Design an enzyme around this catalytic site. Sequence first.
Site, PDB file in Angstrom:
ATOM      1  N   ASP A 112       0.646  -1.184   0.061  1.00 16.85           N
ATOM      2  CA  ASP A 112      -0.064  -0.158   0.024  1.00 16.85           C
ATOM      3  C   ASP A 112       0.882   1.176  -0.029  1.00 16.85           C
ATOM      4  OD1 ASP A 112      -1.955   1.924   0.311  1.00 16.85           O
ATOM      5  OD2 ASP A 112      -2.312   1.314   2.371  1.00 16.85           O
TER       6      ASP A 112
ATOM      7  N   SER B  58      -0.729  15.467 -12.165  1.00  8.12           N
ATOM      8  CA  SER B  58      -0.935  15.141 -13.450  1.00  8.12           C
ATOM      9  C   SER B  58      -1.259  16.377 -14.384  1.00  8.12           C
ATOM     10  CB  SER B  58      -2.059  14.308 -13.539  1.00  8.12           C
ATOM     11  OG  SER B  58      -2.636  13.744 -14.770  1.00  8.12           O
TER      12      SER B  58
END
Length: 330
Positions: A35, A199
């Site tokens: 994770d 992004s």
Amino acid sequence: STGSATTTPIDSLDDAYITPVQIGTPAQTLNLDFDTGSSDLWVFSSETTASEVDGQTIYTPSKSTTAKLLSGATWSISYGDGSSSSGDVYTDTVSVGGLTVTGQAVESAKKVSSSFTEDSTIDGLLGLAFSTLNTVSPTQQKTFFDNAKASLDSPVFTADLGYHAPGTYNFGFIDTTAYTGSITYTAVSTKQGFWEWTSTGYAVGSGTFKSTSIDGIADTGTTLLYLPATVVSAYWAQVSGAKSSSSVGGYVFPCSATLPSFTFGVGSARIVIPGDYIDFGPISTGSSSCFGGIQSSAGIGINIFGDVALKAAFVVFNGATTPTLGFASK
């Protein structure tokens, strides 16, 4: 040193991925959920409340000659999905794919929430976010990666998750045969303890690319792709009959649909998520309404590039002095 381990979807939907981890001496192999959005290595154990264990493999520290109780240490964690666990702490030898760390904090669960009990396939979590998020008190502990880093050939790990197929976590090297083209690196902020990056935009299907900054985290422990409501609405508007269902808890779509791809920007580069990666199947057994793999982050408070996004890429988690993230197509 290096390590390399195969990671395997837990079910036919890729709801999560498990990777075998050797703990203790002799080794006890547990299948852990790696994770990158948390920083605790915790396991089902011989100390876990018996009624809360249902099929998981447990770590029994009393059978490990290298286990040592970390005196006075406890831990307690709550995850974004509302699940939680807590317990006490041992140090022990932990190996992943041939890479060994001695003295790793292994957090032994005394209590786990129902979601963990109900998933027989996940024996615990191995956190790969920054150690500043580790919950051990009163002395915070380091992640497996942080402990291994100095010994690694290069201070990196890579995630290469498969679509409905196994994949690979590598530590200490970049497998240049595992991706196509080049790896595009992008800046990371560690201010929130995550692999947080921006992004450069998105496209839906064969549509034009929208240049827009989307701050979010690379999180292997989250199944889906959570993005701003505007972006998510633009995606699902291209699927006839798709709608946001308050009762189901997100966007659903007719299972008869063909889903468009979704592209996200990494600098000037583009990662394309095929439409099929966005299908999470019937909302309930036998239903013709299917659950979407792109969902709104509104009210999560953060955008999350979970498995839906990451499995479309070869992803480098660069733990150099100034961390960065790399993405390549594959």
